[PDB]
Amino acid sequence: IVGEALEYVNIGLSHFLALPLAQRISLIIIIPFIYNIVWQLLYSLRKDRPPLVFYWIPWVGSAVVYGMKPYEFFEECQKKYGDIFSFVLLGRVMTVYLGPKGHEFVFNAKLADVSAEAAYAHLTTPVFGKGVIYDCPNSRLMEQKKFVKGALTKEAFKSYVPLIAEEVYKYFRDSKNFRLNERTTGTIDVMVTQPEMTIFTASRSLLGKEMRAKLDTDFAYLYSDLDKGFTPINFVFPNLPLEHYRKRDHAQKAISGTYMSLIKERRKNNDIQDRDLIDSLMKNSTYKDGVKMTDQEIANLLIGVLMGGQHTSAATSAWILLHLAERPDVQQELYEEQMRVLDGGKKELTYDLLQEMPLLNQTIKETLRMHHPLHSLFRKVMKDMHVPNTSYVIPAGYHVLVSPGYTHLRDEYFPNAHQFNIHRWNNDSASSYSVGEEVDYGFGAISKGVSSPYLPFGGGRHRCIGEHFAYCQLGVLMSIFIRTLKWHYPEGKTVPPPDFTSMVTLPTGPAKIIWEKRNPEQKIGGRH
Ligand code: HEM
Ligand SMILES: O[C@@](Cn1cnnn1)(c1ccc(F)cc1F)C(F)(F)c1ccc(-c2ccc(OC(F)(F)F)cc2)cn1
């Protein structure tokens, strides 16, 4: 008789349901925690799965450790388990593939194996709007990137350079952080100054003078609100009945409206030229199946590209200034190059002259190596993936995580990886370099191999299309900083650690530098 025993199963369940509320609430915690521990131990005998990082708290997983310092988490995991390992993150299973073969396994994954929009849609769509980037099929994204890249040409960069330089000189003249006509030395926070310079220069060149002029009004409040909405909290809390979210949503509606007003006002007056990205998106924003982007999708794609280039470029800027601020030898070297290429300052900065400043371009290159703005890129795995040369299978529903920024800081690929050395790039000062065969996913010919250990702009179909614009912008910025100012740290200060819980790996604030004018009596002309 085990019928007697199955009777006691029923009896035992009734006694459980009659336990005090003190013991049942403690059991609604103990039973998940123990089953979590038993499951992991049985999962560790699966030979068709990467090793899984142990963790106590269910659902949360390695969240805290990974979120606070992810490169140190990866290196500990890499020493324990090798280059392929999985870890649980706020409900998901993330399979990291570290190193250049992980660049290949993720960035070059078949379109049917992995989805970037499935990983990112809740991150970006609430900020940018609907129908663009990750709120549309991949084929739509590929052509959207063709549209934007069609405004990012050599000829456009030759007109952006004097526009960007004008904004920098105006910032030095008019901003309270400088006032170079009035002050010859001062202290700035680079996390204050660089996001401002970045949007001022990005607005003026990409969006035009009307949109730039709007940031001198109360309208700048809306960019701030929108900017605050650009956060990784959206991964788990995209829309909450909270106040930050309404200012964010209001700002998205208000900013896309301004852009549409200009779009419809320029099409009504047929004022459609070749000035800015707006004119280009107006002239060239029809998919190859003949559907035209709407005015609203055009404005949402403007917010996406402006927001993305905003955070990457302003963090990089801030990092270039923070590193140079303890390197007066590099400032000095960079300044000699300015004097040589620009005839002691008697030549006007041009896009062409920027391409003859290899040390300045190497400084950007070296900063992006040490401070890759994106420490982790995700795809959601759609179909079961076999990891080559292993017995590993990554089942559907997993995420794959690739981290070229980790590889940038490994000694085995960059000698003395943790030293800032622009001369590691002597005779290799180009933003990036397709080391062979190319391929086109819809937005131009890019590198087919993505095995490079330096991948600041990723690779494959989801590869950045902003790299030439960002060099142009940073190039002009830094060329004017160098020529105008020396700068250094307050006493006993140094490079800050990155913020990895943020949207980009920007420096922990406040990060102050002291500036002094090279020519205290030089004045900046124009009215204010
Ligand atoms: C220092 C500056 C920048 C860096 C290091 C950078 C880095 C990256 C990386 C790593 C990716 C790949 C993301 C992924 O694989 O999930 C990417 C994609 C992209 N970036 Fe950038 N970015 C920068 C600035 C910009 C700028 C200035 C623009 C446009 C003006 C831009 C537009 C884009 C676009 C459209 C994509 C495509 C994403 C996709 O296809 O899913 N970025 N960028
Ligand atoms: O790729 C971006 C940024 N980007 C690139 N180029 N310019 N901007 C982008 C792409 C196309 C655009 F049109 C605009 C745009 F902005 C992005 F999609 F948003 C993006 C994707 C992922 C993350 C990320 C942040 C934190 C993370 O870490 C932890 F721990 F999870 F929080 C992990 C991942 C940040 N940004």
Numbering used by the authors: 7 to 534
Q: Can you list sentences taken from the study reporting this PDB entry?
A:
The fungal cytochrome P450 lanosterol 14α-demethylase (CYP51) is required for the biosynthesis of fungal-specific ergosterol and is the target of azole antifungal drugs. The tetrazole antifungals are a new generation of azoles designed to overcome the toxicity and drug interactions present in imidazole and triazoles. The CYP51 LBP comprises a heme at the base of the active site, a substrate entry channel and a putative product exit channel.
In this study, we report the X-ray crystal structure of VT-1129 (quilseconazole) in complex with S. cerevisiae CYP51 (ScCYP51) as a surrogate to understand the molecular basis of CpCYP51 susceptibility to tetrazoles. As we are currently unable to obtain diffracting crystals of CpCYP51-6×His, we have used instead ScCYP51-6×His as a surrogate to investigate the binding of azole drugs. The structure includes the full protein sequence from isoleucine 7 (I7) to the first histidine of the C-terminal hexa-histidine tag, most of the N-terminal membrane-associated helix, the transmembrane domain and the catalytic domain, including the fungus-specific loop. Strong electron density within the active site allowed modelling of VT-1129. The ligand occupied the sixth axial (distal) coordination site with the heme iron via either the N-3 or N-4 atom of the tetrazole ring, at a distance of 2.1 Å. There are 20 residues within 4 Å of VT-1129. In the absence of water, the Y140 hydroxyl forms a short hydrogen bond only with the heme RCC. The tail of VT-1129 lies in the substrate entry channel.
